[PDB]
Structure formats: C-alpha cells, structure tokens
Structure 1
Amino acid sequence: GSLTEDGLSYKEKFVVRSYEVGSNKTATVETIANLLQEVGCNHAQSVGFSTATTTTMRKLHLIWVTARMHIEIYKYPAWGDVVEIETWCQSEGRIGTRRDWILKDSVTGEVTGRATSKWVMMNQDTRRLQKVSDDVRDEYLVFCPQEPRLAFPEENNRSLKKIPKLEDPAQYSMIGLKPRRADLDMNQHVNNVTYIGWVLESIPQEIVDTHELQVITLDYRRECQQDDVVDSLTTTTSDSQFLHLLRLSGDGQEINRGTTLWRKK
C-alpha cells in the first residue's frame, strides 16, 4: 500500500482469500469491514502514527472510538480477485473525525463499494466522551484534505439517518452470543467487526440464501466486555429492510443499534 501523490489519502490492494468468502464464493461483509480497518491502520502508520493517537492524546490518555459505521456494497469481490481500497480522514469540528473509504475492482477500475465512519474522542480510563481540543486537532489537520471530500455526498443520505430503538417482541433473535479470543484486537477489546457479525446472526438464513446485503449502518453505544453475553434482535421494517438491536443478555443494556438493506439475488 501507499499514500497518494498529495499525501492526503492512502491506497492498498488485497487479494480475496479462500477463508474470507461465503457460500456465493465472494467476500463476506465482515471480510470487507476487516480490510477497511486494515487499510485505515496502514494509512495511520504511513503518516507517522506510532504502533492512531497524537502526542497530546497520549499525554491526556485519549483515544479514537467508532460511533457509527456505514457500508454500501454494489458487488462483493470473488475469491482470488484483487480489490483496491482508498481511504482518507476529515475533521468535522469539535464533534470528532470521519474516515471514508472507496472500494474498486482493480481490473476494471469501477467503484464496487463505499464506506464512512464517525469517530469520537474518549478518555481510555474513564470512558468519558468530550469534544476535540484545538491542540489535538492541529496535530492531525495536516494529514486531512481541507476541502470536503465525501464518499456519501448526497444531501441527507442513508449514512446520516437516525436509527430508532427496536421494540419488544423482536421478529427474530439469536441469544447467548459470546466473544472468543479471536474476536479480540491487540488491546484485548472486542473488534468492531465482531458486532457486525453479531447483528447479522439474527437475520434468517432464507434471507441470506436469496438476497445480497447491500447497505449496513451500525451505531456503537457501549462496548461488549470479554465476559459479557449478547442477544441479537431483528425485525423486518419493509428489497428487504431490517431494524437491529444488540443488548446484554442479562439486564438488556443496549450495546448497538442498526439497519440493513438487502437486494433479491
């Protein structure tokens, strides 16, 4: 992979692996989400982030945390295909930052997918959110394009729509989901992609067999600890559309809410 000529975005090519594909022999949405996080990490490393916190963030024990992930796939790359992904960051004032991605077929150059994410600053010890200071902002502004560059430019598009809370009883559910060591990242926290997999666990297999996932929007509210147990709830709201909720199996504390849009194969 490499930073582009202007040093304001990063591109990397990936060959889809045998274990990364589903029954259609194309990459799963979890493989795509893993590749988006990989190209994001390689981008941070390439612009100087130590092995993505700035000097002032490390001093104040502050970290970036995902608030929302939104992915739209037009065509999933097949096993053996090369997919090229370009990513960049942009500040959205004191609220936080946005990381965007564009996925392309390396052979044709056509856009096969796009993604966007909202990141907020959190104190790693107290878990208190807080806005972005001018000192922190000034440290990372030099790595972002200044004119707006949006993967989702359309005025008030799917990536920015408010998501309601699923009301009991859910139409479908998958209960007692627990993370194993492979679900954790290098910091022993549950990987963000695991939550996407858990959301998808409550979609009936008949939908997965006759449809392709087109759009997924996920809000992150609270993290699942290594010893927590999760229930995944889904209700049809309609192409098929679903409303999703992940909550702790015991007291019902919300961890995530989301929506999915599926296209008939």
Structure 2
Amino acid sequence: GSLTEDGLSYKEKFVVRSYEVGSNKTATVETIANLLQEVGCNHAQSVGFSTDGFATTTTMRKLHLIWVTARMHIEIYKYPAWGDVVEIETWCQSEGRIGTRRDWILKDSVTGEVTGRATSKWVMMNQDTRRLQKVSDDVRDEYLVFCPQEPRLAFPEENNRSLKKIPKLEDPAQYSMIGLKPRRADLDMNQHVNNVTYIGWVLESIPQEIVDTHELQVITLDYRRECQQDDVVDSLTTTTSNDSQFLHLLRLSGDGQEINRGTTLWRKK
C-alpha cells in the first residue's frame, strides 16, 4: 500500500483468502471489516501516528488519550470472490470538537468499479478513566495537515443511513444467541476485544435461513461499552420490515448492560 499523490488518503490491494470466504465463496462482512482496520492501521503508520488501533499523537500519549470507534457503517454492493483483488482507499476528517471520521471506498481491481463503502465515527477518550472529552485545538491541529480540507464523504446523500438514530430493542427479542464469549483470537495486541468480533456477535442471532437466502447489504453498529475478556454476551435480533431489516442488541449476559446496538439490511439473492 501507499499514500496517494496528494498524501491525503491511502490505498492498498488485498487478494481474498480461502479462509476469508463464506458459503457463497465470497468474502464475509467480518473479512471486509478486518481489511478496513488493516488499511486504517497502514495509513496511520505511513504518517507517523500510533499503530495500536488508537492512531494517537505524542501529545495524546502523554495525556493517556485514545481514539475509540463510536459507530461503524458498512454498505456492500458485491462481496469479492476468493482469489479476487480488492483495492481499498481510506481517509480521515475532523468533525469539529465532537470527534473524527474515517471513510473507505472498496473497488474491484480489475474493473475499477465501486463494490462497497464504509464510514466510522470516532471519539477521544481517556484510556484509564474511560471519560470522553471534546477534542482540543492543539490536538485537532496536529491532524488537519493529514486530512482533506474540503469535505470528502463516502456517504454524501441528504438523509443517509450512516447518520440515522438507532432505537433500543425491547424484550422479548424475536431471535437470540446466548452465552457468547471471546477467545484469544478475538483479542487485539493490547488484549482488548477486536471491534470486528462485535459484528460477528450481532450476526449470530440472525436465523441461518436468512443468511442462506439473502445477502447482507448494510450494517450500522453503535459501540457503547467494551466487552471485557472475561465477560459473556447475549445477541438479540427482531425483524423490523423483498428486503429484510433487523434491529440488534448486544448486552452482558448477567445484568443485561448494553454493549452495542445496530441495524442490518439484507436483500434476496
């Protein structure tokens, strides 16, 4: 991979692997989400920021501040087949004192056509206290020279799906998968549960008949609280809708504390 000519975005090519595909012989949404994280990490390395997933400056490291994903929104038109080459372009942009945004465009390497797009909202948080804080001018200025100055949005549309408010699923859920636990393969280098694991956990409560007759088109996922390595999770889903839509809730198995909420949109194969 490499930064583009103007140095304000990063591109990288990936060949889809045999273990990265599902029952359709095409890449799963979790393989896609891992590739988004990989290209995000290589973009941070290219410009001197931390490579641990929190993309910090030396100023943020001294204050124990990190960037944390608040929302992930992914829209796939065609999942790359095994052996296909996918090219992903990524960039970041400040959104005032609220937080920052990382966007991605996925393309078929052979045809040059757009096969997907994603956006994510990030907030700044103290690593130890877990307290959120509005971005300061001095931290903001450190990032502005690595971002486009004019707005560049993967989801420019008027009332786009990426910014819609997600409601809380009310019991009883129509479907559930109970007692989900992370294993060591689900942890990152800092022993935190990888953000992509939560996507997998959300999808566990979708009936197999939906997965077998439909394809996932859109997933929007809010991240409210972290699942610890020793926590147990319950994944809940209810149909809200040719296209099928679902409302999702991930909560801790004991007290029912919310860790994530989301929506998925599926189209008939």
Cα distance, 1:56 vs structure 2? 1.2
Q: Within 1, Cα distance between the matches of 2:50 and 2:29?
A: 29
Structure 1 residues 92-115: Cα deviation after superposition (integer angstroms, max 9, x where no partner): 000010000000000000000000
Q: Within 1, Cα distance between the matches of 2:106 and 2:225?
A: 29
TM-score, length of structure 1 as denominator length: 0.99
Cα distance, 1:49 vs structure 2? 1.5
Q: Within 1, Cα distance between the matches of 2:50 and 2:97?
A: 23
The gaps in structure 2 that reach 5 residues or longer are: none
Q: Within 1, Cα distance between the matches of 2:220 and 2:266?
A: 12
Q: Within 1, Cα distance between the matches of 2:195 and 2:6?
A: 30
Q: Within 2, Cα distance between the matches of 1:146 and 1:131?
A: 20
Q: Within 2, Cα distance between the matches of 1:192 and 1:54?
A: 21
Q: Within 2, Cα distance between the matches of 1:131 and 1:49?
A: 20
> SS state of the match for residue 195, structure 1?
helix
Q: Within 1, Cα distance between the matches of 2:159 and 2:189?
A: 36
Deviates more, 1:43-52 or 1:27-36: 43-52
Q: Within 1, Cα distance between the matches of 2:141 and 2:116?
A: 31
Report how many residues are paired: 265
Cα distance, 1:55 vs structure 2? 1.7
Cα distance, 1:59 vs structure 2? 1.1
> SS state of the match for residue 143, structure 1?
coil
Match status 1:262 vs 2:266: yes
Cα distance, 1:50 vs structure 2? 3.9
Deviates more, 1:144-153 or 1:52-61: 52-61
> SS state of the match for residue 131, structure 1?
coil
Structure 1 residues 57-98: Cα deviation after superposition (integer angstroms, max 9, x where no partner): 011100000000000000000000000000000000000100
Q: Within 1, Cα distance between the matches of 2:86 and 2:252?
A: 36
Q: Within 1, Cα distance between the matches of 2:117 and 2:156?
A: 11
Q: Within 2, Cα distance between the matches of 1:250 and 1:30?
A: 27
Q: Within 1, Cα distance between the matches of 2:141 and 2:64?
A: 17
Cα distance, 1:259 vs structure 2? 0.1
Name the counterpart of 1:60.
63
Cα distance, 1:155 vs structure 2? 1.1
Cα distance, 1:48 vs structure 2? 1.2
Q: Which runs of 4+ in 1 moved over 4 A?
A: none
Taking a change above 3 Å as real, the CA distance of residues 8 and 81 of structure 1, as seen in their structure-2 partners, is same
TM-score, length of structure 2 as denominator length: 0.98
Structure 1 residues 115-173: Cα deviation after superposition (integer angstroms, max 9, x where no partner): 00000000000000010001111111110001000000001210000000000000000
Q: Within 2, Cα distance between the matches of 1:49 and 1:92?
A: 19
> SS state of the match for residue 145, structure 2?
helix
Superposed counterparts of 1:145-164, under 5 Å: 145-164=148-167
Identity across aligned pairs (percent)?
A: 100
Cα distance, 1:192 vs structure 2? 0.1
Name the counterpart of 1:246.
250
> SS state of the match for residue 75, structure 2?
strand
Taking a change above 3 Å as real, the CA distance of residues 33 and 147 of structure 1, as seen in their structure-2 partners, is same
Q: Within 2, Cα distance between the matches of 1:156 and 1:7?
A: 30
Cα distance, 1:181 vs structure 2? 0.2
Structure 1 residues 204-257: Cα deviation after superposition (integer angstroms, max 9, x where no partner): 000000000000000000000000000000000000000000000000000000
